[PDB]
Structure formats: structure tokens, C-alpha cells
Design a protein around this ligand. Structure first.
Ligand SMILES: Nc1nc2c(ncn2[C@H]2C[C@H](O)[C@@H](COP(=O)(O)CP(=O)(O)OP(=O)(O)O)O2)c(=O)[nH]1
Ligand SMILES: [Cl-]
Ligand SMILES: [Cl-]
Ligand SMILES: [Mg+2]
Ligand SMILES: [Mn+2]
Ligand SMILES: [Mn+2]
Ligand SMILES: [Mn+2]
Ligand code: NA
Ligand code: NA
Length: 312
DNA sequence: CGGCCTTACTG
DNA sequence: CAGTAG
DNA sequence: GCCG
């Protein structure tokens, strides 16, 4: 639905993002969750006592939601270090995180021009810098579809049986997608092998793939651009998995990230372990049979949720 | 007090 | 391994 | 940050 407390979240997001880019990950996680809670809430919040009651919101956070409701402002925001805007600028480079951002800042850099001419850049960071603007824009769902079909087409040319599905935000039904996450497998349980590498060659020779960021056993993180004019470069992620891990692979890749974390966390409390490979029992333990996503929720004693309902 | 998901690539 | 990322 |  819609957020009934944007006047609150909007202010907290600024602070959460500040801590994030500065390296205070755990505190930033607290705000991130506090924020997620406020958003998905039946109606607007009105009181302190009303705030604390909400899971994910404690005394310190409740206080802040108050200052906002009463002072209409968050004094804390008035003291965010002047290095934050630059740290955010830097970490928006794919391949560069909080540590690299702080280092560059310590060395005197303040702008991308500074980074381009003087900073030391890993191969990935150079690619991220080159597509800085493109990677900041979420693409129209329709374009996400075009990309999925492109990979599926190139893949099925090797084996018409190969199953290709765009997961991530796409499968969750979002209007726009930051990238395209394509899962590839095969019902025969063995044909998925021996393609990955050749598939990337096809897409590469075809001019579709323009830059590679990470190439591994079953995962690929790269960059693509549809043919024709008016096209931006888009991030593309592909994972090839054995059909026996389909349900878990699909569940993982569909996300959301926070949804995955919660689900894995729950599994953990029940003496189980959840990954993109399988759902098991604490130690490794035994692999529980999971033919479908629903089997995962069931085994975890959770009511099934549609992909569109997995925001967190 | 102390975890806060879990796995994988890069160098 | 640390850093970054899905 | 929050929570067990
Ligand atoms: N367990 C886990 N799963 C994750 C994590 N990050 C991502 N995933 C899973 C869940 C996530 O759905 C999937 C794709 O990750 P992206 O493509 O990076 C983010 P998307 O949701 O696709 O939305 P977009 O911003 O692209 O429009 O990997 C993480 O930290 N942990
Ligand atoms: Cl985190
Ligand atoms: Cl360009
Ligand atoms: Mg995505
Ligand atoms: Mn992705
Ligand atoms: Mn471009
Ligand atoms: Mn694996
Ligand atoms: Na609380
Ligand atoms: Na980055």
C-alpha cells in the first residue's frame, strides 16, 4: 500500500544513510529496520508509547519519532558530517564501498573528477565509474522484460529446455528495476551444466554484454545494453543452478534481501539453515526436500507469501 | 553482553 | 584474509 | 540503532 509516516521516515532515512556511508553498519541496520516498520504500518503513528510498542522501535528511536512529530524537525540531521555527501558520491561507484570511500576522502578527493584523475581504481570500480549515471537509474519494467528475453533467447539456442526466469525486483512485480537478475536451470537436472561460459560468449559476440564485473562457478555479474539508440547500460546478473536446488535458488534470487535475511534468521532460530542451495538442519545437518517455494515456508511454519509480498 | 543471513568472487 | 556484492 |  502507501506509507502513512513518510514525514518521519524521510527524516530518518537521511540519518540511516549517513551512518551507512560512514561505516556504522549495525546502527544503520537499526534505522533501516525501524524505517521499514514505520512504512508498512496500518495507520500514521501518533505517540511515543505508541511508537515503542512497535517491534523494531525502541526508546532511542521512539524519542526521535517524537522530536519529528513535535519539533517538526530532527536536530540530529543538523550535525551530519560534511563528508557524508562525498562518501555517498564515492560509494555509488559499483565496486567501491564504505572503506574505499573513506580512504579516498582521507586522501583529499572530493569529486568524481578527483577519482578519475588521481585515485587508484580496481577493474570493477573503473567500470562502475564509467557507467556512474546509468547505474543510478532504475529501468522501466518493460525494458527489464526485453533483457530477460534476450538472455533466454541466447540460452535456449543451446538447449530449448533451459528454463530462464528474471527474479529479483522484477519477479516481485516492481514498476522499475535497478537491474535484471536471471536464474537459469533445467528440469532434466543435468543440462544446466556446460552452458554458462558459452552463453556469455554468445551474448558477448552479439554485442549485448559490454563489461564483466564478476565471473564465478554459477554466478555472473556484468553489464549489458539493448541494441539501437536511446539505450542506457544496465547491470545484469545471471546464476545457473542445478534443478535440485531450484526452489531455494528461486526463493533466494527473488528476495527481497531483507526478506531473505528474516527468513534465514527464522530458520536459524528453529535449528535450521537456509541458503540458495537448500534448507537444512543445524550442525552440517540434513537437507530437507524442497520441490517448491511453498515447501520452504511450510517447513519453516510460515504462511506462504507471493513474490509481490516479499518486501521485508 | 553480543548477534544483527549466508555464500561467493576479487586481489 | 578484507572488501564488496547478490 | 534493536532485540533476545
Ligand atoms: N541473503 C541475501 N540475499 C540477497 C542480498 N542482496 C540481494 N539478495 C537477493 C535478494 C534480491 O532480490 C536478489 C537480487 O539482488 P539485487 O538485484 O541486488 C536487488 P533487487 O531486489 O533485485 O532489486 P533491484 O534494486 O535490483 O531492483 O538477491 C543479501 O545481502 N543477502
Ligand atoms: Cl548489514
Ligand atoms: Cl556510455
Ligand atoms: Mg535486482
Ligand atoms: Mn542483481
Ligand atoms: Mn551508457
Ligand atoms: Mn553455490
Ligand atoms: Na519495541
Ligand atoms: Na558501491
Amino acid at each position: 500500500a502507501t506509507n502513512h509516516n513518510l514525514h518521519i521516515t524521510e527524516k530518518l532515512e537521511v540519518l540511516a544513510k549517513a551512518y551507512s556511508v560512514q561505516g556504522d553498519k549495525w546502527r544503520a541496520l537499526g534505522y533501516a529496520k525501524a524505517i521499514n516498520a514505520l512504512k508498512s504500518f496500518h495507520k500514521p503513528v501518533t505517540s511515543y508509547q505508541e511508537a515503542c510498542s512497535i517491534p523494531g522501535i525502541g526508546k532511542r528511536m521512539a524519542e526521535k519519532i517524537i522530536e519529528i512529530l513535535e519539533s517538526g524537525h530532527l536536530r540530529k540531521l543538523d550535525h551530519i558530517s560534511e563528508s557524508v555527501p562525498v562518501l555517498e558520491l564515492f560509494s555509488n561507484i559499483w565496486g567501491a564501498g564504505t572503506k574505499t570511500a573513506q580512504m579516498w576522502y582521507q586522501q583529499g578527493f572530493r569529486s568524481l573528477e578527483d577519482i578519475r584523475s588521481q585515485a587508484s581504481l580496481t577493474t570493477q570500480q573503473a567500470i562502475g565509474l564509467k557507467h556512474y549515471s546509468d547505474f543510478l537509474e532504475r529501468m522501466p519494467r518493460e525494458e527489464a522484460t526485453e533483457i530477460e528475453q534476450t538472455v533466454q533467447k541466447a540460452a535456449q539456442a543451446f538447449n530449448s529446455g533451459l528454463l530462464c526466469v528474471a527474479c529479483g525486483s522484477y519477479r516481485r512485480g516492481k514498476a522499475t528495476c535497478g537491474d535484471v537478475d536471471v536464474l537459469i536451470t533445467h528440469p532434466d537436472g543435468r543440462s544446466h551444466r556446460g552452458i554458462f561460459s558459452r552463453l556469455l560468449d554468445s551474448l558477448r559476440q552479439e554485442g549485448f554484454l559490454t563489461d564483466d564485473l564478476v565471473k564465478g562457478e554459477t554466478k555472473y555479474l556484468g553489464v549489458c545494453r539493448l541494441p539501437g539508440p536511446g539505450r542506457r547500460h544496465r547491470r545484469l546478473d545471471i546464476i545457473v543452478v542445478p534443478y535440485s536446488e531450484f526452489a531455494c535458488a528461486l526463493l533466494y534470487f527473488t528476495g527481497s534481501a531483507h526478506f531473505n535475511r528474516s527468513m534465514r534468521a527464522l530458520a536459524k532460530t528453529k535449528g535450521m539453515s537456509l541458503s540458495e542451495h537448500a534448507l537444512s538442519t543445524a550442525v552440517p545437518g540434513r537437507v530437507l526436500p524442497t520441490p517448491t517455494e511453498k515447501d520452504v515456508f511450510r517447513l519453516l511454519g510460515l504462511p506462504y507469501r507471493e513474490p509481490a509480498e516479499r518486501d521485508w
